[PDB]
Amino acid sequence: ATKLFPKFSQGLAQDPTTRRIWYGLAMAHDFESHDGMTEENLYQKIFASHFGQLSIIFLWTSGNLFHVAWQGNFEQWVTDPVHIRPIAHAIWDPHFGQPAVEAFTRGGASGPVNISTSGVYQWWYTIGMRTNQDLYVGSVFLALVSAIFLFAGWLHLQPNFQPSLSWFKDAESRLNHHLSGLFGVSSLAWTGHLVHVAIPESRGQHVGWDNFLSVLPHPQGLTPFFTGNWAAYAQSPDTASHVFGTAQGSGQAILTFLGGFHPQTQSLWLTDMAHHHLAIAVIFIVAGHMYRTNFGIGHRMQAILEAHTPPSGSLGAGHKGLFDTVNNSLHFQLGLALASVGTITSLVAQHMYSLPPYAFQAIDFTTQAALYTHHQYIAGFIMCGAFAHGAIFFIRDYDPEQNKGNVLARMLDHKEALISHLSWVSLFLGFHTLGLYVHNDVMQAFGTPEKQILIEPVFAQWIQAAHGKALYGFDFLLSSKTSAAFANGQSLWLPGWLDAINNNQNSLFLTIGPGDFLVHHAIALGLHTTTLILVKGALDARGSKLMPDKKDFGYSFPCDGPGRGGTCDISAYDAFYLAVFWMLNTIGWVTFYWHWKHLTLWQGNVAQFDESSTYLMGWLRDYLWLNSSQLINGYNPFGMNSLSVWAWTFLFGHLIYATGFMFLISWRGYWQELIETLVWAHEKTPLANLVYWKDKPVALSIVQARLVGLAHFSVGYIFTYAAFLIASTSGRF
Amino acid sequence: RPTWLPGLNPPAHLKGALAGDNGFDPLGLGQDEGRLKWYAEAEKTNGRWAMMAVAGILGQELLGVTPAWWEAGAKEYDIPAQALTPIEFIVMGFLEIKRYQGFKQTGTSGFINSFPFDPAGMNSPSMATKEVKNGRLAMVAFIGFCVQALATRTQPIEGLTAHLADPFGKNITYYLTHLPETL
Amino acid sequence: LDPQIVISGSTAAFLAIGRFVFLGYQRREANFDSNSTIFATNDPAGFNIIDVAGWGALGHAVGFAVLAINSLQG
Amino acid sequence: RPMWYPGATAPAHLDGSMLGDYGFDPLRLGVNKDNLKWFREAELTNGRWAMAAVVGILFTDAVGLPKFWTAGAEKYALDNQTLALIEVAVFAVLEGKRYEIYKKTGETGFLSFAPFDPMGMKSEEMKLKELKNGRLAMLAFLGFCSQAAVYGKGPIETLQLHLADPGHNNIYTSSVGPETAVTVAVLCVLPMIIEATK
Amino acid sequence: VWAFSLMFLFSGRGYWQELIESIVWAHNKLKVAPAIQPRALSITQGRAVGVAHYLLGGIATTWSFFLARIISVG
Amino acid sequence: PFVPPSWAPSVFVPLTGLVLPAIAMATLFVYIEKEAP
Amino acid sequence: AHIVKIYDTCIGCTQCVRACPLDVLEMVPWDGCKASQMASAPRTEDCVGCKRCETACPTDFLSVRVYLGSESTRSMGLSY
């Protein structure tokens, strides 16, 4: 009979097989495919889901704060943040034997604990947290915020509180409020916290809710701000002998732009970060008054889009009708948001390792490596999702009649040229990068290392020289002492920036050579190939020569059968599917390069990387084989240490990856026949045929098989690299 | 009917039927009559609470209490603040739920089950306009009390006497500029 | 540098260029830009309170930027 | 017909046919008619057990006998291993006879006696009094365990300590103060939440 | 070679056929399209190529490892 | 203070690991196989 | 159940009906082609979705299309 689950799909509820549960779980968030769904109901469900997501995020943050305040060593880590390892949380496992108990008992705790690698200790220490009471109060506050967000999500679904469809389409009002309030006012408030709490707490002065109304952030007290003498806030900054957390060497300035890093914490100045947030707050608030909402002044995005067509007709109709195809399509907005968020996540990773913002973050090698790898993998997944949603937009929301002659239609008009050129770029990069690598490998194998091709990256070195690095000797722009660009910043920020960039002990514009050139080309190959697969799948989503009516089958369908030569993996979903492997490979190459260069930097031997990164054998032996010795020795027949959990996780990831290869290689048919034999065996077995199944056992579908195999592949990939990176970086240092 | 801006016509959603209707709604928060009447009740009760708060602060200062109005929370009292919060929440929940349910039956204020709570008569539309205007003045006065205590650290009557003693000085300019001297 | 003089002059200058110079261009661009409140004013040129706030905001930003640069002593 | 707050509404399945109805079912677990009878019987037996347990705990503190949470550790004139075997052996037959009573009649019973009332005061008003007293005793037992968890000592001792300083000795000034205060405020806001949406 | 096998074993010929269509378009633009129409490998051929490369890569890996180790230490 | 007792992990870890997932799995299993009227 | 549709480009070659392994299609009289016949799908409740009919269609593009829809015991080809 018809089952209750899933309530959103009547066709799935009538399915008498096990496929009903799987499809009900995988199509729960596809509100557009639900039964009796309207546009207004769609937007309302997304609103409630957004509130629930915020509730989960805030609860997770409160949980991290609570566990650090309860089972951590934050009160002891602030005293000696160079020789004390941060504690994530305690370990309570009845499966642990005695050696595992004393092995994980470290960091000054009274029992087995986990050493945190997220870097929340440095972040909380920099923003002003000093005691466990502060973390406890922050945890309770975030839990209350999470409960409020959850209640808001439940409340916006009840009658008299459901927003209308017209409210969700007010793009001008939403953009104005997000730029001025969500971005500008939030940044201004963060500036207020840095000026009022973080900066005085870094100078040994406690400023909490009990005394912030009686403690002045500056000795002049708002007089220079109102009189326009803003330069008075940059007078007397922290000297080079300032000790973080104490008043020794501290200054009085609150808004500076010294640049560079703090001599002790090796991080950005707090006054510089406060000034940064103040400037971007003013800029975002000003930008929040651009669109017309209810007072006559402002813009209409439709007018700006319609008045942006070239006169010669190079772009056809230009952007006519682009306002309606974006405002009425949620997949277009989701794709734009994911593309921007993925790029910003990558930007965060690069800027965070190169310019550490938190105190004593550069010394924590494990934290730096884990944070960079985490943000780069998150960025790669988000980028793949952006392109997948672009393909979904082409299939479900693109209207050729409304987008007639504009840039959107012209993209599909010459999609063959785009795919062909992406293919050519990827082919050239792959052929040459692989050829140079194999050539260097043959030269190193034959005992002639002077015969390998080592192309110097003169363009990137030229840019590094433009930033102030005098190692290469170009002597121009910031590298030349007689340039206008150099002389115009010598009194504001160039001294600190130049001192930091010319220091070879940090990660600020590291020295590069032929190995960096080759790996950068490998990165370019990965980016271009992943882009080729994603772009080709989005452009061919509506159809191709093999499947002229692909848009009539949806975004995800198994195939079109073995006819016409065979149509396996013809849908756009399959294109995203194949692109996830390339994304994992690209992020693997970038994280491998980052980890090896930083490992050789921290070990004090950059020549090892410079001489072994030019051939793949050096990558396999000097980086993968050499750095995994301590990892695989976490547990051996002679005993175990605290690094055994990473060894177990290493083997765990290998097992999950290999398990994924099963769903990836073997296909449905074999499993369906095997399941039929199992059905016969259960039906003909006494004492067991009395227990019957409620859902008919069937093999996983083709699409489900691909998703399951990719999920196992990605999980094994991530867990294996995370275990190796954390174990190698923590054991070495 | 005079409006807030000279030469500005009052909006269509705002009609002189309400008590203090002066055609002031640049943001257009009272487009529908449902939200308009709910906001009217919200304005009346906000003004009532502000009237009682301003009267209490002025009475506390006039009677010479030891702590200022912004320190009464931390003052020692029998049945500490940790125990006063649940009692207040329970009684306020009962009183407010009775007030809200009485508002659904009839569009007027009340007290538990007296809707409208009007003993001894003396009710008229002019009195309603006076109530709304006094509530608005009390709300603005309470915000003035808060910002005055923040920037000058002086109580309302004390700050008023300080301003009367020296008019050309001891104002927003002096207090905003001579901020370190005040602390 | 007198802050009051600089702020007052910048605000008055921006209000003057917004009322006598760029008012026609802004009105032509606002009408061609195609619930609301009509902020009718007795100004013969139609310069309402919203325009006053916008031009005053621009003048204040310019004046404070000038004061800030002059305060930097460079 | 009073409800669980001044102005509630029955959730379309608590019209009032059952005794002690107040329209309290936010989780809507009694939506099924078959589950309503079983849940009612479970509530009645839980209430009876809580009634006897609360009376027993209150009587032990007056005489001076060991505390209810430490009476098990005391050594009696028997073996705990034999006590558990006898307890499950007797209760197997007792619960089996009680379950068969509910299938034939629908209420509780003792052994082979479904309407167990040797005196005979089984009235409609008496059935509702049993439910009210059982609910009160369930809350009382939860209070006994919670008071012994944070304060220890005992129920009678807890009441005696509360009379010494009622404004300073309460759940809000104890170790679970802020949690219960926030919960009380949320609960006080709850009827307005339900009335605002409806 | 072994990793190369994973390209044929985890993909389908529909994607490759459409990619070939775009490459054929680029060839037709420059009048270099072959008379023999380029078609992607069949489903069976894709599986055969993948298993052949998988076996060759794995067995050759074990062969190189075994021979190098046993010749150097044995 | 918000500090949990020393015995808090010995009670919450077995709860969240065996009692809560068993109840959740049983309730979810009954809900998935429930037949519509 | 799956959705099987016949289009007007059908030439009435009856190759799709002969290739159907569950008797879903049939031939009905028509006047839009030389063969004076047209394919039809009156028993789509028994269609499994093997797409053999699409493989047997000679028109460009196909005259018969199978869109995988809801799954049941018959559409999944389950003998248990």
Ligand code: CHL
């Ligand atoms: C319903 C409205 C209501 C309002 C508006 C306030 C407002 C206030 N309460 Mg209060 N309370 C209210 C209801 C209630 N309170 C309490 C119980 C308490 C307690 C227990 C305390 C307060 C305190 C405070 C103050 C906290 C402000 C601050 O940042 O202090 C930060 C405090 C400091 C930085 C230290 C003192 C500095 C001071 C000498 C310098 C000047 C301070 C400013 C003039 C404050 C300006 C306040 C404005 C912005 C509202 C503030 C004036 C606190 C207080 O009085 O602190 C002195 C306090 O301890 N309230 C209860 C009982 C449950 C209430 C209702 O039931």
Ligand code: CLA
């Ligand atoms: C000033 C008024 C205001 C404010 C503050 C907000 C705020 C918000 N709105 Mg809202 N909105 C408004 C007006 C406003 N809105 C109006 C007038 C309308 C009607 C036109 C809407 C209609 C609307 C809709 C339809 C939705 C929202 C949503 C949201 C939430 C977005 C969630 C998010 O992305 O996290 C916050 C984002 C940021 C804080 C910006 C981050 C900046 C970059 C990306 C990161 C960089 C910062 C820094 C480097 C990282 C920090 C480092 C460290 C701390 C880790 C957010 C809390 C969504 C929602 O409902 O959620 C429940 C949504 O669906 N709004």
Ligand code: CLA
């Ligand atoms: C703001 C982010 C965002 C949002 C709102 C959406 C929203 C949506 N996506 Mg999308 N997507 C995103 C980002 C996002 N996506 C990203 C980052 C990717 C790249 C990974 C994708 C790739 C993608 C594809 C290919 C598809 C969607 C689809 C969809 C739609 C419905 C499917 C669904 O969610 O059902 C529920 C989703 C699930 C049940 C996910 C399954 C569980 C996954 C595999 C996680 C497994 C992790 C594993 C358990 C870890 C365990 C490890 C541990 C045990 C050791 C929906 C509107 C589908 C669609 O549009 O339908 C046509 C579609 O096919 N997305």
Ligand code: CLA
């Ligand atoms: C190590 C494994 C591996 C390798 C080498 C490749 C290689 C390639 N992939 Mg691929 N891929 C892989 C794994 C791999 N993939 C996996 C696991 C997946 C997920 C299923 C994908 C999914 C995928 C997709 C979806 C796409 C590609 C594409 C491509 C091509 C990109 C163009 C290029 O870089 O030119 C360089 C060429 C090479 C690196 C090939 C090697 C050349 C050999 C070594 C030279 C010949 C040797 C010698 C002269 C003769 C020996 C023969 C002997 C029998 C005599 C390229 C041939 C894209 C494409 O087709 O671009 C147009 C495409 O869209 N891949």
Ligand code: CLA
């Ligand atoms: C390492 C990856 C991997 C794993 C684990 C498996 C596992 C399995 N394969 Mg398989 N296979 C793989 C790779 C893998 N394969 C690949 C890459 C291919 C493509 C060539 C195939 C192709 C293939 C075919 C064609 C067939 C199988 C079959 C089987 C099953 C054999 C039955 C068995 O071994 O009993 C026991 C199961 C195991 C040993 C797997 C590990 C189980 C662990 C050790 C137990 C952990 C239990 C634990 C308590 C769970 C608690 C979890 C907790 C969260 C609650 C088995 C489940 C055959 C089959 O159907 O079965 C008869 C079959 O015909 N595989």
Ligand code: CLA
């Ligand atoms: C998402 C945040 C988060 C995460 C990932 C964890 C993770 C963990 N907690 Mg913790 N906890 C949290 C929040 C979090 N907690 C908060 C906010 C509190 C304050 C109330 C606590 C209080 C707490 C205590 C007292 C203890 C733990 C313990 C533990 C560990 C044992 C496993 C466990 O779940 O115990 C149980 C965790 C809880 C009972 C807290 C959950 C309470 C929240 C409000 C409910 C969350 C609902 C959830 C989001 C819904 C999704 C779950 C599922 C339906 C999908 C584990 C590492 C134990 C430990 O330390 O082991 C050594 C332990 O004793 N936690």
Ligand code: CLA
């Ligand atoms: C995540 C939560 C979790 C927790 C808290 C435990 C806890 C425990 N596990 Mg277990 N386990 C888990 C997950 C978990 N496991 C998972 C996911 C797997 C699959 C990978 C396993 C696989 C596993 C195996 C193979 C074994 C254990 C064993 C044990 C016990 C350790 C034996 C011991 O030294 O103490 C001493 C043990 C005792 C004093 C006996 C206590 C008997 C039970 C626990 C008490 C009575 C049961 C209780 C009343 C009813 C609970 C049911 C409930 C869900 C409704 C211990 C109580 C071992 C074991 O069971 O011991 C025989 C063992 O062999 N676990």
Ligand SMILES: CC1=C(/C=C/C(C)=C/C=C\C(C)=C\C=C\C=C(C)\C=C\C=C(C)\C=C\C2=C(C)CCCC2(C)C)C(C)(C)CCC1
């Ligand atoms: C498919 C599709 C789509 C699309 C997507 C995309 C588009 C993606 C991508 C991509 C990306 C991801 C992009 C990005 C980019 C970037 C850029 C474009 C940039 C730039 C730059 C600049 C301009 C800079 C400059 C400079 C320098 C050089 C340095 C210093 C500073 C300065 C500023 C000077 C959508 C969804 C829409 C829908 C439809 C479909």
Ligand SMILES: CCCCCCCCCCCCO[C@@H]1O[C@H](CO)[C@@H](O[C@H]2O[C@H](CO)[C@@H](O)[C@H](O)[C@H]2O)[C@H](O)[C@H]1O
């Ligand atoms: C921090 C938040 C959590 C604590 C919440 C405190 C209780 C809040 C209750 C939920 C909010 C209710 O909020 C308020 O509800 C009332 C009562 O229905 C609604 O008012 C409604 O009834 C009035 C009565 O005539 C109608 O005129 C009106 O058209 C209608 O909207 C308001 O539009 C809404 O602003």
Ligand SMILES: CC1=C(C/C=C(\C)CCC[C@H](C)CCC[C@H](C)CCCC(C)C)C(=O)c2ccccc2C1=O
């Ligand atoms: C890459 C790939 C292809 C594309 C593979 C192709 C097109 C084979 C390429 C082989 C050669 C390069 C084709 C041309 C051979 C010429 C004879 C070479 C002439 C060049 C001179 C130098 C001799 C599939 O067709 C396929 C099908 C099914 C599952 C997976 C896949 C798959 O992974």
Ligand code: SF4
């Ligand atoms: S195979 Fe195609 S052309 Fe032939 S009868 Fe069937 S639908 Fe018509």
Ligand SMILES: [Ca+2]
């Ligand atoms: Ca502090």
